[PDB]
Ligand binder design. Structure first.
Ligand SMILES: Nc1ncnc2c1ncn2[C@@H]1O[C@H](COP(=O)(O)OP(=O)(O)O)[C@@H](O)[C@H]1O
Lengths: 56, 514
């Protein structure tokens, strides 16, 4: 545990080399990702809760 | 002979077992869902047993008998309409191995009746009675039995409606209840659901007219049932229409014909008329409405048969028909009318109904977006249902699987104590009582055999110990969890299951047809 803002390198689009996505990266809204993960989890739970599909 | 009735009984038992096994993974709060596919390709997700039992269709005597038994159980008690099928299936599975050895059905039926009577007497001697002559104990029982049907927020939302509906203290603690005899909960769209209050008399929602002042007190109801439709012609055009002649004739038939009937009807006091639904009338002549606008105008449409039955029962009158009527048996009660909106949209009129022999009071609920109105309706329905079930008797007990194991152990010890060849058949009942706790343990996510053995050991050691928990996921005492159920939901279910088993066992021979 040294820091939380740095040491967060990621992927690059120009070539296959790790680049720090802080000094020149593009930030993304966290609420969008949170809602997407919640919707994916809800869909997975709904699909797993389905048992049979026979006409009962 | 003997082969044909045996094959018929085997086929009936197999069909009943298939019907019982078609749905089984749905008992308890952690049940599985099922997607029923329609004939056109539409799919519907559901988890209730009654809906699946009433939606599917199959032609078979045993299946029809089971459907009728489930319907009778849902009509009588109203709760636990899925355990009776499993009980009947277990009893039939036991009777299969009982008949495979070579026992007459009469001894088996007598043993089943004796075991049912013993179980009923044990359930009545084990349950503890309460009191309900006052309002404090009744409210305590209501708030103790109401906090275990749905989720916490829905319970907190329905608690005001629950305590408003339970305040209807009409019967002075009688044997039976009349909660289904004089109750007409209406539904209204628009506004806030918090504006709810008990209303007597009658509640309507149709606009009377749109003229000057309409604030009178003339019975507030027009007891009329004769035909008001216009006389239809024999064809489209009886002759050739072009200039006058034919125009004046139809003008006089539209203006100077029904007006004479209106004049001869309005000669009697209390000029209050109405009509039923406009399902058979094509178009009403507006000239009659314009001529009726004078000397007070009052008309209310959109009336069903249930509304007529409710009005004729709350006030205490009988409708009349025919035209040749020179009597005076059509008046009502005059008190107050002409109501406005309650700060919002949607027209709705209320009458408190003062000085009336019928003290029928209903609950006018509201809502928004058609999402919290049906939920509140179902909540208050379950509330008054469980209130009637609790007021029908006084005994209560907790669920989870402990009473089933207790009854199984008692039947085992009775078959061990009682002598006779029928005792073996009684032992079959001892093997037809440990299905609900095993199913609950399997649906929870633990070992069912080990849990059943531990419960049996605890019941043999310390008599009344604990049961099966769902929220925590272990074995905890039920006295901490606020969850109970009346004794009728078990006694009536067991009696109905035993009766159905005896009926399906006494029917045999050949099944002739036309
Ligand atoms: N809070 C609870 N704790 C333990 N068991 C419960 C609880 N609520 C319900 N059950 C069990 O669920 C069973 C009924 O489940 P289900 O079939 O879904 O309802 P119903 O019988 O009213 O249709 C009962 O036998 C009861 O033992």
């Amino acid at each position: 545990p040294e820091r939380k803002n740095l040491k967060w390198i990621g992927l690059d689009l120009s070539n296959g080399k790790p680049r720090d996505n802080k000094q020149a990266g593009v930030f993304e809204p966290t609420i969008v990702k949170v809602k997407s993960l919640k919707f994916a989890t809800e869909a997975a739970i709904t699909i797993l809760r389905i048992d049979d599909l026979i006409k009962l | 002979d003997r082969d044909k009735p045996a094959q018929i009984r085997f086929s009936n038992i197999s069909a009943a077992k298939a019907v019982a096994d078609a749905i089984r993974t749905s008992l308890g709060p952690k049940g599985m869902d099922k997607m029923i596919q329609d004939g056109k390709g539409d799919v519907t997700i559901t988890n209730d047993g009654a809906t699946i039992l009433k939606q599917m269709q199959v032609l078979h005597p045993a299946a029809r008998m089971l459907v009728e038994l489930s319907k009778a159980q849902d009509i009588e008690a109203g709760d636990g309409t899925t355990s009776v099928v499993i009980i009947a299936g277990s009893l039939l599975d036991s009777c299969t191995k009982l008949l495979q050895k070579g026992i007459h059905p009469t001894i088996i039926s007598e043993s089943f009746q004796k075991a049912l009577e013993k179980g009923i007497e044990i359930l009545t001697d084990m349950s503890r009675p309460v009191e309900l002559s006052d309002r404090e104990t009744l409210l305590n029982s209501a708030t103790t039995s109401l906090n275990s049907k749905v989720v916490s927020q829905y319970s907190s939302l329905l608690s005001p409606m629950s305590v408003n509906a339970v305040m209807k203290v009409i019967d002075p603690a009688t044997a039976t209840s009349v909660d289904l005899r004089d109750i007409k909960i209406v539904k209204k769209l628009g506004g806030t659901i918090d504006d709810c209050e008990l209303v007597e008399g009658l509640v309507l929602t149709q606009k009377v007219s749109n003229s000057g002042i309409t604030r009178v007190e003339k019975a507030k109801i027009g007891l009329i049932q004769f035909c008001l439709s216009a006389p239809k012609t024999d064809m489209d055009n009886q002759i050739v229409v072009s200039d006058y002649a034919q125009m004046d004739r139809v003008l006089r038939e539209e203006r100077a014909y029904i007006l004479n009937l209106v004049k001869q009807i309005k000669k009697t006091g209390c000029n209050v008329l109405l009509i039923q639904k406009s399902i058979l009338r094509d178009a009403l002549s507006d000239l009659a409405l314009h001529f009726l606008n004078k000397m007070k105008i009052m008309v209310i449409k959109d009336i069903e048969r249930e509304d007529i039955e409710f009005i004729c029962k709350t006030i205490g009158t009988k409708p009349v028909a025919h035209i040749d009527q020179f009597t005076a048996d059509m008046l009502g009660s005059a008190e107050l009318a002409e109501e406005v909106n309650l700060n919002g949209s949607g027209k709705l009129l209320k009458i408190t109904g003062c000085a009336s022999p019928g003290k029928t009071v209903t609950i006018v609920v509201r809502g928004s977006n058609k999402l919290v109105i049906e939920e509140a309706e179902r909540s208050i329905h379950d509330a008054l249902c469980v209130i009637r079930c609790l007021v029908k008797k006084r005994a209560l007990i907790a669920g989870g699987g402990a009473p089933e194991i207790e009854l199984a152990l008692r039947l085992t010890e009775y078959s061990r104590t009682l002598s006779g060849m029928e005792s073996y058949c009684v032992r079959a009942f001892a093997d037809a009582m440990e299905v609900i706790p095993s199913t609950l343990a399997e649906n929870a996510g633990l070992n069912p055999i080990s849990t059943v053995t531990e419960l049996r050991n605890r019941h043999a050691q310390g008599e009344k110990t604990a049961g099966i928990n769902v929220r925590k996921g272990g074995i905890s005492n039920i006295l901490e969890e606020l969850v109970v159920q009346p004794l009728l939901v078990s006694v009536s279910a067991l009696t109905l299951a035993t009766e159905t088993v005896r009926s399906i066992l006494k029917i045999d021979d050949v099944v002739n047809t036309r």
